[PDB]
Design a protein around this ligand. Structure first.
Ligand SMILES: CC(=O)SCCNC(=O)CCNC(=O)[C@H](O)C(C)(C)COP(=O)(O)OP(=O)(O)OC[C@H]1O[C@@H](n2cnc3c(N)ncnc32)[C@H](O)[C@@H]1OP(=O)(O)O
Ligand SMILES: Nc1ncnc2c1ncn2[C@@H]1O[C@H](COP(=O)(O)OP(=O)(O)O)[C@@H](O)[C@H]1O
Ligand SMILES: *C(=O)CCCC[C@@H]1SC[C@@H]2NC(=O)N[C@@H]21
Ligand SMILES: [Mg+2]
Ligand SMILES: [Zn+2]
Lengths: 77, 284, 449, 316, 57
């Protein structure tokens, strides 16, 4: 299916706060307009938005691991 | 064989300490910028040229020449008399805005000088509860008009207000008529008055003196009207036209004179005032 | 010493910086685009970061992306090299304030020297000779412009003070088109360098491009290496350099080196820079200063034994100059012939895939490039695909070694400018040494019936 | 893009322009360009003089609407400076067919109002070929009032085929707007000077043309109705338009001798399109000379003199 | 005749600042120059039913 990729380079996270809930969950489907993860750069936490609706097939990333441009983060079927 | 090498991940954790106050963001475009650079560019995002918020006193500093700033009517302060009972007490929001913005009311008045030509200026601090027009705002505007009349010089006001101050009820509404009377008084005298529409100008101020000056200069991509777009959306229960209530659109619909970007604003205002007052043009 | 730096560039200079870093024991950070994911230096680096898509504006001119990459990897300095962000003063200011170290001049000196009119004014302030001219951007009065031109002497040239890269300058032959030429040059400067400032300077017809490389740590120390000579220019861009230059006796060499050192001391310069000049009958005319590692840097290393990038990395680390004026020895001669993937005649870039590659090798041959078998040349950046040097004992030996290397050198699959290099080498005036800057254009000739 | 009767000049100019390119065209040709260019220019000048020695009211109309001619923007750029364009009617829209603004002239700020047509077809479509909607006339009223307020001189231009006969124009009080303009402009306290650059008339253009002075170009027409309309009405045929133009006297000398204007502004030989810069220089000199003497008058005496000149209108 | 429009406009302006009213009534039809000179310029615009009023036919 479609896999979301971070358009920027920086620290990766899943909870917008140090102690909070992740934006999305594996399994349960997500829609076109939704925030899925945070790719922080220069201490400015920006949001990552998908573009297609579907079931969350799997999550290919882990919290705290930096990623870059064109990096497949989460696959959506 | 380095020709065929895979890409390993970067170090999972390294302690890096960039100073916190040297980077901002522009939601209009997304290009991260240098804060000092942006502040030196009159709060304009250099990439997409999308104007942002600016402090009222910062705007006065940008326009008026340094070494001539003279604040007028600084003694007036919010003196609430209605005792409004909202979900929060009006004193709560009043104190919060006063302690946050460091200013007594939305309007800030400073008699200055422009390229050797004396001029009065004023501006609305949008952060003061949506820059609503209080009794202090109207009284300070009238004070500036009186200074212009007794000391012949053009008056300039920059509009930024989310609407009339509800917690002052009808009293703020009468300030519209008071400012209109001041404008009528000074307009038959012959002293110009150029109101510039920032982002955004809505509510009562939009229909009191923002859209009543000799010139209607709007700044690009600003929201100008009388009723907020959500109210119109709930009224006509339909879709707004594309680019609704944008300076580009509102100059098409004839309510807006010209669209001037902030870096050019000082020279443009000086030239227009010099021509209208029939004074010699400023030397650049 | 800088524990770990960032190669804020791509290609040949990136590979050279990577080799120098691995020599000095400094770790490596590779920043690249999505198209250049198989660069030689990228593959030969520990940490590779992709900071944008194919276009230069989104990937390599993305200062926020570079600073983000330098933050995530933990570097404490960044090397820009030449090109891209080499002379971006604002880039230097941001890197200085972002918490890292800029390998190069302080942003103040970048602002003072990059702008050509300010640089000329500062050089005159320091006593360095400059071309007589307007000494200031001229207005819209044609009478003033022609009066100044007659004062300095026709012909005259209009050059963008914030200009560079062999463009943004127009030569004026007469007053019949002076105003229009100035206006269109200002428009081109606006379209290229984001500055409308254009000035007037005396135009010469028979110059000899002479430039002197210098070094300074900004702590009262200023040393100058040997000279250079790029007489073979095409479209004001260099194709064949050589160092030291013919005719420049050691008396003149020391005489101008002392002045350049005094200028660096007065300006408080830091990093590696070169003071360009114009040579004629013993007169030098400063026109510009390149506050970066110049592309034709090897022809100074091989004739002095001093590695320029090592000098920059030591200076940026705060160490004082380890080499004194008497400890610099000029021993030899050199020639350099850039290799570009353009069309030999029409000068149209010819990107694609390389099929067969083979380095020259041999005594005195030093082949600086990143191209390899199967390397696909991207149609997105400059057309340079490698530098080539042949250090000899005299000029004739260097020319002979260059001829042999060019015979040995083989690049197949894309169009290359090797044929023009061979023709230049075969020229008698070129082998004699001391041709004028336009010599190449005279050999170019013109249209035919 | 030339007219019917301009064929001898047109052919030679297809060869003069090339010679500049032929100086370095190809094959190492750098022929004796100078003398041949000078001879061809001499021939072209003589042919143009011979052609425009013979002139006709239709030819006058064609030159007035030659699809290459200085509009109001051209004259503002090439004769005025420091032009700041003011838009907006405050009411409904800003119609492009009228261009107004405030500019400085010899250190004295002036108000410039005039119609603009457009060079390219896209610009002509965007500007409605110079046909002003009523909101444009309201804008002109507002600008004239503003100029009246700050003791400012007013100089206006008249280059328009006619007031726009559209659905929207009639729906929005066309006649009402023109009447409102014509009433206020007789009460202004500052001099009003107007020029008939291009082609202007049809009555609607008079809403910005009632002032102390009126001037016309050498190849301009100022008629109550369009010649084609006059033909189609009176002669019951459109093709008799040149006859109607000859009968009316829309040509510049006819309207000059009728004591309706002040003076005819001469054009560069070849018309205004051949040398727009010389035309701009002539227009600048004429307007400066006209503005010089008028500024002596005081506002009350100026209005009284205008009223007396207003009474001077008409034969009776 | 076109200048007569301006002359009548001047007369109307003269008498309007004095304060004497002027009521123009639009019959069938009112078109052309008169429609835009004083027909549509009085203190009142009284039309008679089914009349053709405008500027251009
Ligand atoms: C009838 C009147 O004159 S007042 C009616 C309110 N205003 C309008 O209807 C006109 C525009 N309506 C609006 O909502 C806005 O002004 C808009 C459309 C420009 C949107 O601008 P926004 O970015 O959404 O600004 P916003 O409305 O949040 O204003 C910021 C703050 O000012 C406050 N504010 C703005 N105008 C007023 C007002 N007239 N009275 C009281 N508070 C006000 C808001 O409550 C808000 O406070 P909060 O952030 O602490 O909750
Ligand atoms: N005043 C001048 N007279 C003659 N040639 C010049 C002059 N200025 C520049 N040039 C030519 O252009 C080349 C590049 O000039 P430079 O100012 O260094 O521009 P750039 O910034 O594009 O490199 C010089 O090496 C020289 O050959
Ligand atoms: C900056 O000083 C460190 C904070 C960065 C984000 C924090 S640390 C890990 C927490 N979980 C998460 O997703 N982000 C939080
Ligand atoms: Mg150079
Ligand atoms: Zn932006």
């Amino acid at each position: 299916g479609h896999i979301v990729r971070s358009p920027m380079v920086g620290t990766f996270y899943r909870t917008p706060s140090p102690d909070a809930k992740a934006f999305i969950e594996v399994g349960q489907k997500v829609n076109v307009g939704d925030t899925l993860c945070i790719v922080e750069a220069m201490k400015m936490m920006n949001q990552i938005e998908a573009d297609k609706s579907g079931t969350v097939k799997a999550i290919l990333v882990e919290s705290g691991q930096p990623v870059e441009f064109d990096e497949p983060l989460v696959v959506i079927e | 064989s380095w020709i065929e090498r895979i890409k390993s991940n970067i170090t999972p954790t390294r302690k890096a300490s960039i100073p916190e106050g040297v980077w901002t963001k522009c939601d209009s475009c997304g290009q991260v910028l240098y804060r000092a650079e942006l502040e030196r560019n009159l709060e304009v995002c250099p990439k997409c040229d999308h104007h942002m918020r600016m402090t009222a006193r910062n705007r006065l500093h940008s326009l008026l020449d340094e070494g001539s700033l003279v604040e007028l009517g600084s003694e007036l302060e919010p003196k609430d008399v209605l005792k409004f009972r909202d979900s929060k007490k009006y004193k709560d929001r009043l104190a919060s805005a006063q302690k946050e913005t460091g200013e007594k009311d939305a309007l800030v008045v400073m008699k200055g000088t422009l390229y050797g030509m004396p001029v009065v200026a004023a501006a609305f601090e949008f952060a003061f509860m949506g820059g609503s027009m209080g009794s202090v705002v109207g009284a300070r505007f009238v004070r500036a008009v009186e200074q212009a009349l007794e000391d012949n010089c053009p008056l300039i006001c920059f509009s930024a207000s989310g609407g009339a101050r509800m917690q002052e009820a009808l009293m703020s509404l009468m300030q519209m008529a008071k400012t209109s009377a001041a404008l009528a008084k000074m307009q038959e005298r012959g002293l110009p008055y150029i109101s510039v529409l920032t982002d955004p100008t809505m509510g009562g101020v939009s229909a009191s003196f923002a859209m009543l000056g000799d010139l209607n200069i709007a700044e690009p991509k600003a929201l100008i009207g009388f009723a907020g777009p959500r109210v119109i959306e709930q009224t006509v229960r339909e879709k707004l036209p594309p680019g609704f209530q944008r300076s580009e659109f509102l100059i098409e619909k004839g309510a807006i004179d010209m669209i001037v970007r902030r870096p050019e604003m000082r020279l443009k205002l000086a030239s227009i005032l010099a021509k209208l007052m029939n004074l010699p043009a400023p030397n650049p | 010493m800088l524990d770990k730096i960032v190669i804020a560039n791509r290609g040949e200079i990136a590979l050279r910086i990577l080799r120098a870093c691995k020599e000095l024991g400094i770790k490596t950070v590779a920043v690249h685009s999505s198209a250049d994911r198989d660069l030689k230096h990228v593959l030969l680096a520990d940490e590779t970061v992709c900071i944008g898509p194919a276009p230069s504006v989104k990937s390599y001119l993305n200062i926020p992306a570079i600073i983000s990459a330098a933050e995530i990897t933990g570097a404490v300095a960044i090397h820009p090299g030449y090109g891209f962000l080499s002379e971006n003063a604002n880039f230097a200011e941001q890197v200085e304030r972002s918490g890292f170290i800029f390998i190069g001049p302080k942003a103040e000196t970048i602002r003072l020297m990059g702008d050509k009119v300010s640089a000329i004014a500062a050089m005159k302030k320091a006593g360095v000779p400059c071309v007589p001219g307007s000494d200031g951007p001229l207005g819209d009065d044609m009478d003033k412009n022609r009066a100044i031109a007659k004062r300095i002497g026709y012909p005259v040239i209009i050059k963008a003070s914030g200009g560079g890269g062999g463009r943004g300058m127009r030569v004026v032959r007469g007053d019949a088109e002076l105003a229009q030429s100035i206006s269109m040059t200002r428009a081109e400067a606006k379209a290229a360098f984001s500055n409308d400032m254009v000035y007037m300077e005396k135009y010469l017809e028979n110059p000899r491009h002479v430039e002197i490389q210098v070094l300074a740590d900004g702590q009262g120390n200023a040393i100058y290496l040997a000279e250079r000579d790029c007489s073979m220019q095409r479209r004001h861009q260099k194709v064949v350099e050589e160092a030291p230059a013919p005719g420049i006796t050691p008396e003149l060499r020391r005489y101008i080196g002392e002045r350049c050192a005094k200028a660096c001391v007065d300006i408080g310069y830091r990093g590696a820079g070169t003071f360009e000049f114009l040579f004629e009958n013993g007169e030098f005319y400063f026109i510009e200063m390149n506050t970066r590692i110049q592309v034709e840097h090897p022809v100074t290393e091989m004739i002095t034994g001093v590695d320029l990038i090592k000098e920059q990395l030591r200076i940026a680390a705060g160490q004082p100059l380890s080499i004194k004026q008497e400890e610099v020895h000029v021993r030899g001669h050199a020639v350099e012939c850039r290799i570009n993937a353009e069309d030999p005649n029409t000068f149209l870039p010819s990107p694609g895939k390389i099929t067969r590659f083979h380095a020259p090798g041999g005594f005195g041959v030093r082949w600086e490039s990143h191209i390899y078998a199967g390397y696909t040349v991207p149609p997105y950046y400059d057309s340079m695909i490698g530098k080539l040097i042949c250090y000899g004992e005299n000029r004739d030996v260097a020319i002979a070694r260059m001829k042999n290397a060019l015979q040995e050198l083989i690049i197949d699959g894309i169009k290359t400018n090797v044929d023009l290099q061979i023709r230049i080498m075969n020229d008698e005036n070129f082998q004699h040494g001391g041709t004028n800057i336009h010599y190449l254009e005279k050999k170019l000739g013109l249209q035919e019936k | 893009n030339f007219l019917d009767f301009e064929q001898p000049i047109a052919e030679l100019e297809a060869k003069i322009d090339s010679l500049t390119a032929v100086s370095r065209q190809d094959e190492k040709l750098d022929i004796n360009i100078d003398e041949e260019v000078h001879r061809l220019r001499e021939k072209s000048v003589e042919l143009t003089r011979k052609i425009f020695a013979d002139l006709g009211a239709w030819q006058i109309a064609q030159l007035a609407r030659h699809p290459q001619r200085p509009y109001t923007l051209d004259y503002v750029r090439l004769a005025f400076d420091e032009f700041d364009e003011l838009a907006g009617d405050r009411a409904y829209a800003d119609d492009k067919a009228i261009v107004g603004g405030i500019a400085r002239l010899d250190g004295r700020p002036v108000m410039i109002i005039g119609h603009q047509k457009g060079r390219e077809t896209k610009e002509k479509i965007r500007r409605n070929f110079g046909m002003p909607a009523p909101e444009g006339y309201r804008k002109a009223l507002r600008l004239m009032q503003m100029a009246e307020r700050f003791k400012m001189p007013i100089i206006t231009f008249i280059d328009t085929p006619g007031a726009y006969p559209g659905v929207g124009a009639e729906e929005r009080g066309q006649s009402e707007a023109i009447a409102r303009n014509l009433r206020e402009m007789s009460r202004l306290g500052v001099p009003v000077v107007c020029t008939v650059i291009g082609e202007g008339g049809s009555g609607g253009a008079l809403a910005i043309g009632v002032g102390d002075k009126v001037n016309m170009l050498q190849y301009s027409t100022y008629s109550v109705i369009s010649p084609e309309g006059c033909a189609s009405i009176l002669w019951k045929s459109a093709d008799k338009a040149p006859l109607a133009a000859e009968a009316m006297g829309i040509i510049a000398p006819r309207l000059k001798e009728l004591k309706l204007i002040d003076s005819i502004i001469p054009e560069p030989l070849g018309g205004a399109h051949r040398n727009p810069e010389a035309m701009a220089a002539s227009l600048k000199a004429q307007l400066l000379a006209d503005l010089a003497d008028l500024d002596v008058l005081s506002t009350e005496d100026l209005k009284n003199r205008r009223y007396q000149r207003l009474m001077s209108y008409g034969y009776a």
